[PDB]
Amino acid sequence: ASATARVRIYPLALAKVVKHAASSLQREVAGLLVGKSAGKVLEIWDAVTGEQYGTPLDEMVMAKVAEELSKSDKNLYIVGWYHSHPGLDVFLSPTDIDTQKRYQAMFSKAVALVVDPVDYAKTRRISSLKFKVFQISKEGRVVSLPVS
C-alpha cells in the first residue's frame, strides 16, 4: 500500500513519545522518530524533540532538538515524527498529511505516529493508548501500518 510494510516501536521510544504527549495535554506536541530500516520493517528505536513538556520559540526548538540529536546513536537516523492530538482521535489532519508528504520526500520509508494520549493520561494504562502509524501512498491515501 505504501513504502514501509510495517513498523516495530521499541519500548524506550514508545515511552518517550507517550511521556511527552501525556505530559502536555493542552498542546499538540511533536518530535522526531529515530531508528533504522531492516528491509521492509521500520524500527523505531528512540524519539527526540525540541519542544517543551507540559505548560510552556523556533530558536529554542532547534537548540534542544540539536542537543538531543547530538547524543543519539550514530547507527540510527530520522525515520519519521510523532504528533499528539489530545481528544481528537487518531488520524492525520490535512496539515499532517502535508507534513508527512514532506517527510517522505526526505526519506521514503518515513512514518507519522499520531497519538491521542487523553485516555492513557486518565486511566494510566498503556492499553488505553490511542495511536496509529501512518504513511501517504503515491496516489495520496492515508495508510495505517501494522505496528508491533
Numbering used by the authors: -3 to 52, 57 to 148
What does the paper say about this structure?
C. subterraneum Ub (CsUb), E1, E2, and E3 are organized in a single operon, adjacent to a second E3 protein and a JAMM protease (CsRpn11) with high sequence similarity to eukaryotic Rpn119. We have shown that CsRpn11 is highly active on its own, cleaving both CsUb precursors and, at a later stage of the ubiquitination cascade, CsUb-conjugated substrate proteins. Our bioinformatic, structural, and biochemical results reveal unique features of the archaeal proteins, but also remarkable conceptual similarities with their eukaryotic counterparts.
To determine crystal structures for CsRpn11, we used the full-length wild-type form and a series of truncated proteins with deletions C-terminal of the JAMM core domain. Using these constructs, we obtained crystals for full-length CsRpn11 and truncated CsRpn11Δ149–202, for which we collected data to 1.65 Å and 1.35 Å resolution. We located two protomers in the asymmetric unit, which form a homodimer grossly reminiscent of the Rpn8–Rpn11 heterodimer. However, while the latter is assembled in an antiparallel fashion, the CsRpn11 homodimer is parallel, with an interface formed by the first and the fourth alpha-helix, H1 and H4, of CsRpn11. At 45 °C, truncated CsRpn11 processed CsUb-pre with a KM of 24.2 µM and a kcat of 3.5 min−1, and bound the reaction product with a KD of 14.6 µM.
